[PDB]
Amino acid sequence: MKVMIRKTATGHSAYVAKKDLEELIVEMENPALWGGKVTLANGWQLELPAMAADTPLPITVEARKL
Numbered sequence: 001m002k003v004m005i006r007k008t009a010t011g012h013s014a015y016v017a018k019k020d021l022e023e024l025i026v027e028m029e030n031p032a033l034w035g036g037k038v039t040l041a042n043g044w045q046l047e048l049p050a051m052a053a054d055t056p057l058p059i060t061v062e063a064r065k066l
Contacts, residue, residue, distance in 0.1 A: 007033075
């Protein structure tokens with residue numbers, strides 16, 4: 001599965017490729033982002049394998065929704 005976590009210093013966005021859904025991160029496992037699960041403003045939850053808690057660049061990882 002494919003998901004692209006797009007990042008800014010303050011901005012946090014997640015692009016669910018399989019749905020073409022890019023939504024704002026309103027709820028996080030860790031105040032940064034990564035750690036366990038994340039929830040978009042749409043209500044969708046995406047799991048983070050936990051690496052670079054606040055990524056300084058748009059990273060593409062596997063999609064695993066809750």
